[PDB]
């Protein structure tokens, strides 16, 4: 079976710049290499075939190259919307083998998270459960640590996190961090906190609450 | 132009059988063959085999010779993947794609995918919860409000902050499974002029359980 190998699996370029994604077959496959693109949570789109022939209506800024066992796709003037997984396939002899896909991150300048904490819905407390939601919206870079602290004590557990994949429009990431206590544990306490450390600040970006009017 | 729309996602307990349909339009079915592919989450894209819409003859890939069965309703231009005895590692998404050339080396025009959640678990319908802020001016002259959609199975869930209308500044987050159920949430940011002034409403539809909710985020503060 011809093995197609891609390395690395994650790549970061700036806007308007260039990236070159290497793919590599394990025997001479005679330029019979297809490149597909899979925009975050969509189908693949056949971008190029026979190493450099562009399919119908992919813009000439996608250029491929290669010989033997070494091929590469180049993207120039990288649009915020080229963030996707790029895949090489081999198209020479059966079966049609693929490469692992390389993820292309877009390298924006920094942003800082619009952190915001939410008390339980009264509704939920009536169900006898208490989730405390903290959103941390639109930060750049991707590396954010969030800790929950109830009554100044750390709370590692009962937490579920989810990150939005990088935003195609304004190249940023965003994350929910959810704490889910028992109505009693919730109703036994008072200071809930969501603290985030990010490249954007040395000092903790911290949001705390207990109920009050405004 | 070419459009290959497929069946909707499917939940099926282990050892069951599923027929995933794929309906072609734009081209002449008979002169292009169907390519079926598995994009399993932590692994990538796999060719499964190809069928000749002119003779009806399938080729299968090694990892697929056995439970997978290609079949075609020529007359409606439909290819269907039938999987029998659903071994759990069939939790993945199946794409059908038009094989350009003979044997399907070039897949040009792909289908949107169908997702098989092979699972013993039961359908649980969700808890849509309006999260109004403990005020907290979320950036200068802005307020971010939220909607926690807890406790449902299986995935998907459609979430729209007011009937598709709050479109900019929405962040629906990917769902995460805590052993038996998922927890999903969205945020929306508005200017202070707009809320509590207009009615922001979380319009959540769980289509597996025939559930449609509209939790109004009422000002509670």
From Swiss-Prot, chain B:
Name the Gene Ontology biological process terms.
antibody-dependent cellular cytotoxicity; antigen processing and presentation; complement activation, classical pathway; early endosome to late endosome transport; endosome to lysosome transport; humoral immune response mediated by circulating immunoglobulin; immunoglobulin mediated immune response; phagocytosis, engulfment
Q: Which cellular component, as a GO term, is one annotated location?
A: immunoglobulin complex, circulating
The alphabetized UniProt keywords are:
Cell membrane, Disulfide bond, Glycoprotein, Immunoglobulin domain, Membrane, Repeat, Transmembrane, Transmembrane helix
Keyword check for Cell inner membrane, yes or no: no
UniProt main location, coarse: membrane
UniProt-recorded Gene Ontology molecular function terms:
antigen binding
Q: What is this protein called?
A: Immunoglobulin heavy constant gamma 2A
The major lineage groups are:
Eukaryota, Metazoa, Chordata, Craniata, Vertebrata
UniProt lists the gene as Ighg2a
């Amino acid at each position: 079976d011809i093995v197609m190998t891609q390395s690395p699996k994650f790549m970061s370029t700036s806007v308007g710049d260039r990236v070159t994604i290497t793919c590599k077959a394990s025997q001479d496959v005679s330029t019979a290499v297809v490149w597909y693109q899979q925009k975050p949570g969509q189908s693949p789109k056949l971008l190029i075939y026979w190493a450099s022939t562009r399919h119908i209506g992919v813009p000439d800024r996608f250029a491929g190259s290669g010989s033997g066992t070494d091929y590469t796709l180049t993207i120039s003037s990288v649009q915020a919307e080229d963030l996707a997984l790029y895949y090489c396939q081999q198209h020479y002899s059966p079966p049609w083998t693929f490469g692992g896909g390389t993820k292309l991150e877009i390298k924006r300048a920094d942003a800082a998270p619009t952190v915001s904490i939410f008390p339980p819905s009264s509704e939920q407390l009536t169900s006898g459960g208490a989730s405390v939601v903290c959103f941390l919206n639109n930060f750049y870079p991707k590396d954010i640590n969030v800790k929950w602290k109830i009554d100044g004590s750390e709370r590692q557990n009962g937490v579920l996190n989810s990150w939005t994949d990088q935003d195609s429009k304004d190249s940023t990431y965003s994350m929910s961090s959810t704490l889910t206590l028992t109505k009693d544990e919730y109703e036994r306490h008072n200071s809930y906190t969501c603290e985030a450390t990010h490249k954007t600040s040395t000092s903790p970006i911290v949001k705390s609450f207990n109920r009050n009017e405004c | 132009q070419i459009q290959l729309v497929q069946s909707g996602p499917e939940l099926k307990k282990p050892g069951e059988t599923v027929k995933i349909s794929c309906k072609a339009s734009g081209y002449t079915f008979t002169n292009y063959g169907m390519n079926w592919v598995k994009q399993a989450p932590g692994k990538g894209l796999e060719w499964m085999g190809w069928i000749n819409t002119n003779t009806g003859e399938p080729t299968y890939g090694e990892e697929f010779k056995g439970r997978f069965a290609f079949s075609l309703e020529t007359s409606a231009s439909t290819a269907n993947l039938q999987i029998n005895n659903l071994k759990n590692e069939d939790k993945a998404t199946f794409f059908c794609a038009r094989g350009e050339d003979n044997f399907g080396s070039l897949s040009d025009y792909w289908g949107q995918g169908t997702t098989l959640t092979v699972s013993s678990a039961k359908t649980t319908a969700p808890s849509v919860y309006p999260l109004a802020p403990v005020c907290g001016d979320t950036t200068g002259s802005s307020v971010t409000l939220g909607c926690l959609v807890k406790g449902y199975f299986p995935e998907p869930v459609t979430l729209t902050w007011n009937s598709g209308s709050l479109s900019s500044g929405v962040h629906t987050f990917p769902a995460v499974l805590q052993s038996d159920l998922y927890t999903l949430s969205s945020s929306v940011t508005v200017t202070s002029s707009t809320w509590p002034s207009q009615s922001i409403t979380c319009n959540v539809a769980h289509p597996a359980s025939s559930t449609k909710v509209d939790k109004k985020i009422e000002p509670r503060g």
